[PDB]
């Protein structure tokens, strides 16, 4: 019956410290600065994940500053935060108390893949649409996640609700101010990042998202490899070798290098024959060399592949109705407001 009380600040709320009690602590994972716990808030009985990160004594923690501003049904909610000692002696850790979500897109995808079954397309639609909304939302603040991958897509597999998490690499990108190129995880990295660009844009998240879509359709990553060399070969095998004009749009330092000379594989042969053609069309507009030619997240939400979700009679295969899909805010719609008349159907 072990109960722990700390002074913590609500993640949103007013900036007023309060007493927070929790219990039933258990290890659920490990992060870069110590293990990740589950706990149960005594007040409400709700489950939270508690994650530790390093507090820099010179600047404010960027991940905390971003999470305090975010309020969206497809992004993990920051419930509280507080400071403590930790794994390394003499160190002060930031603890981020997040709403707990028990599964991820990756687990669901591996479950199907290992059974040699295709994830039913209605779930590919639901998951990718919610991912794109979360991206349109954070991108409308200038914020790029920089680490989109299936393991960062939390999932309630009963309601089909998805929530984007892990804002440890996220950054408000300012044009003309360089960024480190070494973010984003193996298999999901845009080619401009593989080339070491420091002047990239939020479209690196849309590439990563297209990689997640392709993986859901293929049952395995589309561009695997343990080095950027091997990853690039897999990209070139699908997209063909980039032209000098494309390389200049990615990283102009790379324009004159010798790359493998390979003609593009047709998109209709990248996926199995019965892949829905709208899914292939959408993929081909996300996995583009030229960063500015990729769909924006909000253009992706309005793509024809997601038309079934705007059908008034669409339901989950388990007979539940779909999660919330159309409660767009002005903020979320700000990159292009008149997509809302595709985005919000008459029945909403």
């Amino acid at each position: 019956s072990k109960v722990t009380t700390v002074v913590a600040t609500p993640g949103q709320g007013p900036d007023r410290p309060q007493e927070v009690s929790y219990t039933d602590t258990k290890v659920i994972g490990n992060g870069s600065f110590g293990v990740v716990y589950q706990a149960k808030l005594c007040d409400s009985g709700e489950l939270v994940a508690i994650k530790k990160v390093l507090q820099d004594k010179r600047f404010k923690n960027r991940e905390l500053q971003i999470m305090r501003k975010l309020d969206h049904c497809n992004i993990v909610r920051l419930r509280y935060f507080f400071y403590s000692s930790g794994e390394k002696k003499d160190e002060v850790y930031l603890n981020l108390v997040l709403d707990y979500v028990p599964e991820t897109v990756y687990r669901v995808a591996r479950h199907y893949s290992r059974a040699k079954q295709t994830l039913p397309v209605i779930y590919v639609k639901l998951y990718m649409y919610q991912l794109f909304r979360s991206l349109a939302y954070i991108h409308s603040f200038g914020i790029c996640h920089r680490d989109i991958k299936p393991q960062n897509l939390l999932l309630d597999p009963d309601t089909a609700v998805l929530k984007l998490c892990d804002f440890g690499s996220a950054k408000q990108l300012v044009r003309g101010e360089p960024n480190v190129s070494y973010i984003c995880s193996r298999y999901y990295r845009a080619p401009e990042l593989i080339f070491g660009a420091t002047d990239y844009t939020s479209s690196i998240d849309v590439w990563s998202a297209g990689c997640v879509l392709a993986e859901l359709l293929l049952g395995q990553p589309i561009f695997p490899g343990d080095s950027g060399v091997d990853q690039l070969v897999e990209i070139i095998k699908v997209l063909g070798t980039p032209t000098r004009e494309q390389i200049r749009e990615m990283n102009p330092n790379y324009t004159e290098f010798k790359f493998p000379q390979i003609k593009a594989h047709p998109w209709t042969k990248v996926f199995r024959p019965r892949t829905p053609p709208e899914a292939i069309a959408l993929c081909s507009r996300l996995l583009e060399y030229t960063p500015t030619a990729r769909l924006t997240p909000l253009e992706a939400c309005a793509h024809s592949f997601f038309d079934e979700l705007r059908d008034p009679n669409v339901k989950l295969p388990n007979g539940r109705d779909t999660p919330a899909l159309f409660n767009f805010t002005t903020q979320e719609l700000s990159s292009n407001p008149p997509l809302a008349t595709i985005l919000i159907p008459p029945h909403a």
């Binding site: 994972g29 028990p102 991820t104 687990r107 479950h111």
Partner: peptide, 10 residues
Amino acid sequence: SFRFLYSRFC
């Protein structure tokens, strides 16, 4: 490589 140690899919 998984986010969590435990899954209903295991």
